[PDB]
């Protein structure tokens, strides 16, 4: 919160197994404003990614 929501760092950081957005398009994230951004970080297996 209280920051500039620049998402180009996510694409620059690494290629990913999956990058699936449900509410918004993955390329519109830098145009929108977000009331509260929460990053839930965890490790799972590939067969559980779905």
């Amino acid at each position: 919160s209280n920051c500039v929501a620049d998402y180009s760092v996510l694409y620059n950081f690494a290629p990913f197994f999956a990058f699936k957005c449900y509410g918004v398009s993955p390329t519109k994230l830098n145009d929108l404003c977000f009331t509260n951004v929460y990053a839930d970080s965890f490790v799972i297996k590939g067969n559980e990614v779905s």
Binding site: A5, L29, L32, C33, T35, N36, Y38, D40, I44
Partner: peptide, 20 residues
Amino acid sequence: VVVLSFELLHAPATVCGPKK
């Protein structure tokens, strides 16, 4: 796995992208 959770409510709070 990182889930970026948010809500869009006409921005009661901002956290806006790199717009000018």
